[PDB]
Amino acid sequence: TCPFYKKIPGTGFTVDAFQYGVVEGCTAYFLTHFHSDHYAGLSKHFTFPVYCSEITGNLLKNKLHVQEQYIHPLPLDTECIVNGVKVVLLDANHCPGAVMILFYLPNGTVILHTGDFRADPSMERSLLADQKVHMLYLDTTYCSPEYTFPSQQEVIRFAINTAFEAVTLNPHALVVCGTYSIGKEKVFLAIADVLGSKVGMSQEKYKTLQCLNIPEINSLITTDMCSSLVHLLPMMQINFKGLQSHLKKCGGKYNQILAFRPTGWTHSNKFTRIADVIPQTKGNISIYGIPYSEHSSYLEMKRFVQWLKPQKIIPTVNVGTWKSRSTMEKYFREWKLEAGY
Template identity: 30%
Template sequence: MPIEMPKGLPFSVDTWTPSSSNNKKHHFLTHAHKDHSQGISTHASFPIYATSITKTLTLNYYPNLDESLFVEIEVGQSVVVDDPMDGFTVTAFDANHCPGAVMFLFEGTFGNILHTGDCRLTPECLQRLPEKYLGKISREPKCRLDYVFLDCTFGTFSSKLPSKHVAIRQVIDCIWNHPDARVVYLTCDLLGQEEILVSVCKTFGSKIFIDKENSPECFQSLSLTVPDIISQDPSSRFQLFDAFPRLSERAEAKLAEARANFQPEPLIIRPSSQWYVYEDVSSEAKKRKIDRFKEARRDQFGIWHVCYSMHSSRDELEWALQLLAPRWVVSTTPECRAMELGYVRRHCSYGNLTPDDPLWKLLDIDLEAPFADESIQDEVSCTTSPFLISQLESSQEVVCTEKEVTTVCSQVQESSVTLFGRARLGLDNSTLIYEKLVKPEISYVDEDAKVKFNDDTCTNRDVSEGQRESNSKDVTEGVVRRDAVSSPNGVGEYIRKLYRSMHVPAPKPLPSLVDLLNERKRAKRKLLS
């Protein structure tokens, strides 16, 4: 998920915006998934560091992109980046995500920073990192990472995900259990699922048919990564099946067509974690919940699901953070995800930083700025992304009076309602929507450092949309400046200048979390009826 890096860093990672292009001298691309390269054809500038596979795939997706912009860096390789202001060293490590995907370790005067990109953190992945950064459960590492930019895609999902190897074995077993299926459709059109196709090809001695006309990008990607498994024979038993759009409708049509022709039903397998993570399974029996990862499961549309994940589960993230023991964690996925991790709640707070800590400079936070309440500096414990703080966007949960704010940062259990789709497209994923601005009042609520407001001063008629957004961002930063509340209507010159400098519209209202949950329940009841 693209996010802007803190102002104190001379580089950007997976971010292709006017801001990153103008303010950062060095650019890094972790892998070739399009949600991490969005905008690269418009805002790319030299140099872009990436692996050779990532470079090739990206140039394949964006043929107008200049190849000379790239500087290749391979897994295990360290590169010294010369910079007149702040030189540093960067090392690439395997991210266990998709072909060419890497984590970047940055070491310089700004500190030691690990950016995971998208990753599936396993013991093998972490063991490849320098030993000095790895601790044990009962002992901190010799050298602590200052920053970890972490893939928290499934940070709210508490169940233990099967390993890639186990998931591939389940795909193979599902095929063995359906010997009468003349055609096997595999929805493995995503970069990173090549291992499944290779295993199927080796196990059954048959290549995979890929429709070049209907799936040109997937065909090109597989031609570059695993060309030996591709078949152009449409009569092949194994065929690639697009996962999107309307997979369930197309699957039902395939099954109905086979029944109409009195033929055996085709086998349709979808190896993905999405069905397990985002489907509502709250009504299942406890034993069924536990067993649903042990073998392929068929849904009401006739699709067989296998939990194949290229992202870490919550347990894997917690385990990795215990070993790395970083001083600060930043989620590269929707803001609220980092707060779901116990390590972040326990260890990542401003209260742990001394006034002379270099992390303040890295975050570009001025400690000498005046506070409305001097006790705030000691009382507010921020467990959110410091990047978001530096950009005046908060990932804290907000507590307001009725109908003032809608948030999706609440603690989610199993069936979470998220802004996953919006975030992956790099759209505005602000989780705070204000219906009216109120006089800010910061108070400590609990360990999550929730922010309170009261509404006894300002109304919608008092403040414009732009001012509302700016004032809210200034408040959620955890710091209320004196000049922010100096004017009669609660909006100071500082806020007006801040908003004008951002040149962004106020966030559009989102439906409440309760409405989203009710809609989901109604949709489920409709399907069951």
């Protein structure tokens, strides 16, 4: 049964609610982005209207085979009427095709659902500037002050410089990058660009990347592993065993692996600067864990919410424990008292 924080009152709408069968009263199912916790339940057998971005639509059609007749893509930054209700989709600064949704309810209330997002000051100059929001359904993944991490630009800077240095010292080194979902594509694209290489990958990951509307993509990626000195592998293989096994397959072309594991936040953030990060090393294999986040830091979240000044907040992450829900409510009340709304 569909939980309350996935229902939009005063409408026939749900958000990211595909794992509960037919939801009573739902005339339109919104999908914020193509991550499995959110799409859980869709397939070629689905027969209700799905509303989403163009990119998310490409992935539904090609990767899950949803029929064309049930896919409704909407452009961003554009006022659209759906089942007689005005909606707008906004870029969420999460993974490719991810959106936030603004709903303009027939009674006058305005609701923002963030989906998954990484708050940014540029959002303060979207169509959000122009009117008041009564309810915010908020991505609270990192809603606690311990959750600190650097900008995406600093993380990419560290990775480019690390890879370029290593391969210039040893032209026979291979770079490997872990992946398990869409998002974070800048990590492997930036490293391959500086090395003058295409990125090599499986047929299945190549198919996924072809759905993303990335400019000039055919110039950037390939299924021919032999021509490439940046390879992608499933995240589960990014360990000493998996990487040894991969180096064997390359036919004595390479004699060293340097690998990157993009994670979310980890506790080594509480002591160490991005500059000071060191790898795990066994022999000719080194593994770097780098904190490339596609969710708001606590400081970014707080800045956005204090700017938006919503009348009510409904968290969508960490909602399963009393302690979690209580903690998040305390922070919302500080932020409100500090800013005066």
